[PDB]
Every structure is written in structure tokens, then in C-alpha cells.
From Swiss-Prot, chain B:
Quaternary state and interactors: The RNAP catalytic core consists of 2 alpha, 1 beta, 1 beta' and 1 omega subunit. When a sigma factor is associated with the core the holoenzyme is formed, which can initiate transcription.
Keywords: DNA-directed RNA polymerase, Magnesium, Metal-binding, Nucleotidyltransferase, Transcription, Transferase, Zinc
Species of the source: Thermus thermophilus (strain ATCC 27634 / DSM 579 / HB8)
Alphabetized GO MF terms: DNA binding; DNA-directed RNA polymerase activity; magnesium ion binding; zinc ion binding
Described purpose of this protein according to its UniProt entry: DNA-dependent RNA polymerase catalyzes the transcription of DNA into RNA using the four ribonucleoside triphosphates as substrates.
One Gene Ontology term from the biological process aspect of the record: DNA-templated transcription
The protein, known as: DNA-directed RNA polymerase subunit beta'
Family: Belongs to the RNA polymerase beta' chain family.
Length: 340, 350
DNA sequence: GCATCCGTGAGTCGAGGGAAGCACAATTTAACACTTTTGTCAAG
DNA sequence: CTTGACAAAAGTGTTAAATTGTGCTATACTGGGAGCCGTCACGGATGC
């Protein structure tokens, strides 16, 4: 109806499909079941994958208005139509079953809208809930059985609510939380609300933990509440003018400050000057063992393979050069300030 | 951004562009010889949902008869507009009228107007006016105890229809195996059954009825009409900027000032696209860029709380809708659900 | 000729602002004996 | 500059345990809800 209102447009679109009567509903469900059984028989006979045959039938039913390439679909269709009458019968039954499944799904969108209107305000918009319930409705149509003589709404409501609740658990938070943990958080909130209304005050973690049951203490309740903390927007306004936002007061502590880079460079320069007093080989040994050349620390055996010397002599010379550096530092005291 | 660049290139108004993009009206890319209300359908024509449905699937209507009363029309008879179907209802379109759910079957035995009652969970498995030998099934049911069989040889007559379906189609009887299947699309001269003895005489969607063992071709056209940004992208891909520029230059000599102004605006857009080296279809996104996460950070404050930007929420909504659309397409969801999800995807991108 | 739609409207500063279960299959993590290499210390 | 052990910090397989992802529940249920004027005033542009 309204071009600018998506919800109204969707409701108008779904209002163009008349509701199914009991006889029509039973006929459609029976046709879907017969089509599925016919697909199974066709797969058993022709030897193809049942899923592949169902996809070919669905592509033919939906027509060319939908984007396995079309050539293999046409080849499989020709192969199925090459079968005798006793098997083209099952092909026709499959086609009618797919058409009936499409009609049955199209006629139960009012039910999913009615189910989804009760889940609003829990992190997902109305239309997202409607589409997730549509997925649940498709699953219900797939798993519905008309032999039990129950109406379609009774079994479809279960699946629609399931899909909507799963979607809320999976997509209503910026930092996704597993479904079991979402159920735990919801149960904890229910318990806290019940205790808050019964005690006439905000419960402490001890009461809440006691009411939750065994295996729950105040520490676990506090950790769960900390987990349940949604992230806050960086663009949330601060003051009354709304010109200032949260992100204007959060410093960046990842990139080093100019002071940090400057003192790192100063330490590097002073260490390079200090290593000059060492011997030509001892300085190299320390700069390799401490990762001052390649960036990563080497082992005694690796430095030996570089120099041809065994590990014991390497540790001895490194210790001697370290002692010499300590002596020079004691005699000069030009490197102690950088240690903080 | 007024004036719309896509609308300027494609010569679509802002209203038409909004209707096509947000799945309010269809736009035609290949009419396939479709006739609408006696007028051939042309390309770039806007079709509403009802017109598209009529052109693509045909005309049909179901009239629910009151309980108990019997229709004056038989199963498989042609009716005209305004003709009375039952004593209390009248049809609104000419076409073949079919019994939807016959509530009673009146078989005539030969030795005998024995009747049998049909319930919602029972379905008729035999056509009207069929000779049934002693033992053959007549009405199938979930429970075999209530299943109806034939005591002796007779003729099966169907009565008490729940409703009448009037469909504008063509019915072709057949005896051998049919060469076509339900849901296929046929043209005049195409084989249907009996090795070429029966051939289609009109366009439409073909369905085989084994109960009545006839082939019904519903009069409809395989029209190519699409909505959303895919149709607009197709139009922009089919655009020939050289030919458009030449036509705009030729129209620039029109005496009218408004015509020259419109031609100048369209030609300025065309010249911009031609000189820049950009392609018009690049105005429709196939891959959405994603900003580096440090420009949309999720930082932890000194208190341990998390602060994130709104771009993360917008990206999450876009990804959720795109993944759900992919799943729905993989499941063969109906056109209404797919259309709604595509519209949501467009709105999330916006 | 009017109707509709759209974009625009000072700067700096501070101050506080901050429907639900339940079962079950996968998957990931923690832990845990064992092989290591990796440092060391002992003298040759 | 060398072996010749050896405490240990590190790395390596399996496993029982949490942790997490997925399916399913059959009376019947079938088109939303928050809207709400000191609607901000005024040029510029499009387009009927």
C-alpha cells in the first residue's frame, strides 16, 4: 500500500493470498507428501541424488525467473521426461507436489506475521522477525504431516516461534553470545525480576544465585551479568547540545605516543653506543641472543651453527660480555635511567 | 540525489525508480509477445503486481458454493462471463470450470443410484462419467475402513462440489503418455501427448491432470519482467552511450525550450559517463566495501566496557539480511518472501 | 503557477555525561603424562 | 673451545570436560503500532 512503509507493503502483499480452507489445506499437504514420495521413487529408479532431482523440479516449477547451471537442469529434465508413462507419472506427481508446497507456504504468511508481532523490541526489527518466522514456516511445511489430522497452524506455530527465538538469540547483540548462554541470561533476568517484585527491592547476587538453583553462587551471577553487558555506541551524545559524543573522550592506547617512540629510539642509540666497547664477536653474540639483529632471539646451538662454536663457549662468552657491560655501566652510569 | 543519475540515464522518473528499486512495480525487459488487455506489452513498461501475475500465470478464480446446494455446471465445461454456475452464484470470467471438492459421488450400478459421501480427509480418485468395474477404488481415504470401493460395474458421477474453479485455459484430452509435465511453458505447435496427435494452440503454463487425464494449458505469457536493482542494472548494462548521445544531440535541435533543456541535462550526464570512463551499471552495487575495523573500532574502555561505532551495527544488519536472503534462495522460498528479503537488503544497503 | 522536495542555518570553551527449554552432536579448551631442546655446571 | 651429564622450560600426543551449535516440540491460533504541530523558515531546483 504505502511505498515508503515496508511493513504496510509486506502486509498488503501477503493479503493478496486468500486463506486456505480445511479441504484446501489437506489437499496441499497431501500433494506435498505425495510429491516428496515421488521424488524419492524417482531417485531410487533413475539413480540420481534425491536432492538434485528436487532442485531440478523446483527450478522447473519456479520457472526461468530465478537465477547447477541451466544446461544440466534441462538435461536432467529431458532425462526424466525420457522415462515411460509409469515413471513420468511420478515426475508429474513431484511437479504438482512442489507447486502445492509453494502455494501452502504462500498462504501462511498471515500466521507468521501474527506470531512475530509478539516478539518485537527484543533486538530485532519487525520485518526481520517476520522473515525468520518465514524460514520457520518453510521448515514446518517440510516437516508437516497431514495423516495426523491436526491443523497446520498447530504444528507450524512451534517452528515459527523456534525460528524467531533462535534468530533473536543469534542476531540481537553486536557481540554474539551462544544460545545456551542467552537462555541462561534470560532465566537469570526472570529470576531477578521475580525476586525484585517479591522482596520489594533490587535483589543482591546472593538471593538471585540461591533462587537460580544448585551450582549458582554470587560470583557466577556477577560474571553472567558482566557477560550480558551490551557494547555502548561510540556516537552516543554526551551533553545537552548533542555535539559531543563518547568517542571524543576515549584515548587511543594502541599506537605508541611520541614520548614512547622517542625513548625507544634513545634506548636503542644508547645500547648501540654501549655495545661498541665490547669486542667484535661478543657484541654480535649478545645482539643475536637478545634478538637485536634478526628481531627474534636465537638459541645457543643456532648461534653456534652461525659461528661454528659449541654452546658452552657461547654461554661463557655471553656471560663475560654481559659482565663487561655491567662494569662499563657501573663506571659510567649512562644507561640506568632507561630501566624505569 | 535529485535529479537521479540512474533515472536520468534510463529516462525513469523518481517515482518510477523508487517503485522498481523497492519492489513496488515490475519493469519489462522482454515481453515475449505478451498482450495486456488487447494491447501488446512493450519493453521498459511498468507492470503492477496484479498485471504481472495476470500476464505470467493467467486468470483464474474460485467461487465457494454454499453447503448442500449442487452446481448446475458439470466438471470440465466451458462457462462465459456472467453465467450462473450454482443457483446462487455467477462466474466473472469465461473459461473451464472445474469441481474443486465434490462432497458426494453418485455412482449408478447396473442390475441403482447408490450414493457415497466424501469428507475433507477423503479425495476422489476417479473422473466424472467414468466406467468402473467391480472392485476398483472410487474415493481414497487415510483409513482403509472408510475407503469407498465399487460393489459392481457402474458409472461414477460427481456431485455436490465444495467450490468451482473457473480458469481461462485450454483442455486437451489425451490417451498415451504426455510429452510435457506440470509447470512447463508451451507455445503454439508444441507437442503435448500422443506423439504429436495433440498440440498446443496457445501460449500458457501446462499442467497434466491424471484424475481427468487431460492436459490444461493456462493462457499466460512467459514475460520477462523484474523488480529491484537487478532489473535496473540490466537496463544500465544494455545502455548504449554512443547511440544515446547521438539521439540526445539530434533531439537538441527541437524548437521547444523545455525539450532542449531536458536533452541538455541527460546529455551532460551521458557526456560525464563517456569522458570519465565509468560504466553506468557501476552505480548498482554487487560487492559492498567494508571499512577497516580500526576506523569503526570496538574498543574496551578502562572500566572493561566495550564501545563500538554504529557502522558495525549497519554492517551486521546488512550481513544478516544478505545471509538470510542466500539461505532463502537456497531453500526455494516463494516469490513474496524473496521479494521482501531483497527489499530489506536494499534498505539495509541504503 | 504551484507544488514538492531538499539542504542550510558562528566560533572557542567546560560539565557531566558513562518463548523456553531439552536432548544430542561437534568443537574447543584444559589437563596430563611423556619427549624433548634449552639452559646450565663440571671439569678437560 | 670441548663433551658429559642433567634440571627445566617447552613442545607433543590423547582424553574427559565444558562449551557451543543444531534440531525439535502436533488442540488451534492467519494484515503492526506508535503515532500525535509553536509542524522551522527560506531559497534553489525539478517537474508537472
Amino acid at each position: 500500500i504505502s511505498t515508503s512503509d515496508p511493513v504496510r507493503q509486506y502486509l498488503h502483499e501477503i493479503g493478496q493470498v486468500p486463506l486456505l480452507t480445511l479441504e484446501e489445506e489437506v489437499e496441499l499437504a497431501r500433494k506435498v507428501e505425495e510429491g516428496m514420495e515421488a521424488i524419492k521413487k524417482l531417485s531410487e529408479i533413475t539413480g540420481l541424488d534425491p536432492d538434485l532431482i528436487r532442485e531440478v523440479v523446483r527450478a522447473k516449477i519456479l520457472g526461468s525467473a530465478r537465477v547447477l547451471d541451466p544446461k544440466t537442469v534441462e538435461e536432467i529434465d529431458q532425462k526424466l521426461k525420457s522415462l515411460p508413462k509409469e515413471h513420468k507419472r511420478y515426475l508429474h506427481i513431484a511437479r504438482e507436489g512442489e507447486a502445492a508446497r509453494q502455494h501452502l507456504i504462500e498462504a501462511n504468511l498471515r500466521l507468521v506475521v501474527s506470531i512475530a508481532k509478539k516478539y518485537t523490541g527484543r533486538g530485532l526489527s519487525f520485518l526481520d522477525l517476520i522473515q525468520e518466522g518465514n524460514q520457520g514456516l518453510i521448515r514446518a511445511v517440510e516437516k508437516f504431516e497431514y495423516k495426523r489430522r491436526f491443523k497446520f497452524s498447530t504444528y507450524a506455530t512451534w517452528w515459527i516461534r523456534q525460528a524467531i527465538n533462535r534468530a533473536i538469540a543469534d542476531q540481537a547483540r553486536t557481540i554474539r553470545i551462544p544460545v545456551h548462554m542467552v537462555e541462561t541470561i534470560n532465566k537469570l533476568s526472570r529470576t531477578a525480576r521475580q525476586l525484585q517484585q517479591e522482596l520489594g527491592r533490587e535483589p543482591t547476587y546472593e538471593e538471585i544465585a540461591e533462587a537460580m538453583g544448585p551450582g549458582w553462587d554470587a560470583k557466577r551471577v556477577e560474571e553472567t551479568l558482566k557477560i550480558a553487558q551490551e557494547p555502548v555506541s561510540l556516537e552516543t551524545p554526551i551533553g545537552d547540545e548533542k555535539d559531543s559524543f563518547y568517542g571524543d573522550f576515549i584515548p587511543d592506547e594502541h599506537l605508541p605516543s611520541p614520548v614512547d617512540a622517542a625513548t625507544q629510539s634513545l634506548l636503542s642509540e644508547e645500547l648501540e653506543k654501549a655495545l661498541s666497547k665490547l669486542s667484535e664477536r661478543e657484541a654480535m653474540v649478545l645482539k643475536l641472543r637478545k634478538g637485536l639483529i634478526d628481531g627474534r632471539e636465537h638459541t645457543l646451538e643456532e648461534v653456534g651453527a652461525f659461528f661454528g662454536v659449541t654452546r658452552e663457549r657461547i654461554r661463557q662468552i655471553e656471560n663475560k660480555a654481559l659482565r663487561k657491560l655491567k662494569y662499563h655501566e657501573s663506571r659510567t652510569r649512562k644507561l640506568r635511567d632507561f630501566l624505569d | 540525489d535529485v535529479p537521479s543519475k540512474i533515472g536520468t540515464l534510463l529516462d525513469l522518473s523518481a517515482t518510477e525508480l523508487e517503485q522498481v528499486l523497492y519492489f513496488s512495480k515490475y519493469i519489462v525487459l522482454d515481453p515475449k509477445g505478451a498482450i495486456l488487455n488487447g494491447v501488446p506489452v512493450e519493453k521498459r513498461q511498468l507492470l503492477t503486481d496484479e498485471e504481472y501475475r495476470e500476464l505470467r500465470y493467467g486468470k483464474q478464480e474460485t467461487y465457494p458454493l454454499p453447503p448442500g446446494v449442487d452446481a448446475l455446471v458439470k466438471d470440465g465445461e466451458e462457462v462465459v462471463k456472467g453465467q450462473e454456475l450454482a443457483p446462487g452464484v455467477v462466474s466473472r470470467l469465461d473459461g473451464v470450470a472445474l469441481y474443486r471438492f465434490p462432497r458426494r459421488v453418485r455412482v449408478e450400478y447396473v442390475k441403482e443410484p447408490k450414493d457415497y459421501r466424501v469428507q475433507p480427509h477423503m479425495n476422489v480418485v476417479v473422473p466424472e462419467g467414468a466406467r468402473v468395474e467391480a472392485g476398483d477404488k472410487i474415493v481414497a481415504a487415510i483409513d482403509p475402513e472408510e475407503e469407498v470401493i465399487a460393489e459392481a460395474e457402474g458409472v461414477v458421477h460427481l456431485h455436490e462440489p465444495a467450490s468451482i474453479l473457473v480458469v481461462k485455459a485450454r483442455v486437451y484430452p489425451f490417451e498415451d503418455d504426455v510429452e510435457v509435465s506440470t509447470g512447463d511453458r508451451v507455445a503454439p505447435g508444441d507437442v503435448l501427448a500422443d506423439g504429436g496427435k495433440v498440440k498446443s494452440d496457445v501460449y500458457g503454463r501446462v499442467e497434466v491432470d491424471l484424475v481427468r487425464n487431460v492436459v490444461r494449458v493456462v493462457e499466460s505469457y512467459d514475460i520477462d519482467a523484474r523488480m529491484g536493482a537487478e532489473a535496473i542494472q540490466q537496463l544500465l548494462k544494455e545502455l548504449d552511450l554512443e547511440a544515446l548521445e547521438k539521439e540526445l544531440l539530434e533531439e537538441m535541435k527541437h524548437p521547444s525550450r523545455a525539450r532542449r533543456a531536458k536533452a541538455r541535462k541527460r546529455l551532460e550526464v551521458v557526456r560525464a559517463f563517456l569522458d570519465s570512463g565509468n560504466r553506468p551499471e557501476w552505480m548498482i552495487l554487487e560487492a559492498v566495501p567494508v571499512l577497516p575495523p580500526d576506523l569503526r573500532p570496538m574498543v574496551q574502555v578502562d572500566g572493561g566496557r566495550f564501545a563500538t561505532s554504529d557502522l558495525n551495527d549497519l554492517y551486521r544488519r546488512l550481513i544478516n539480511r544478505n545471509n538470510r536472503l542466500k539461505k532463502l534462495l537456497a531453500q526455494g522460498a516463494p516469490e513474496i518472501i524473496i521479494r521482501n528479503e531483497k527489499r530489506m537488503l536494499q534498505e539495509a544497503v541504503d
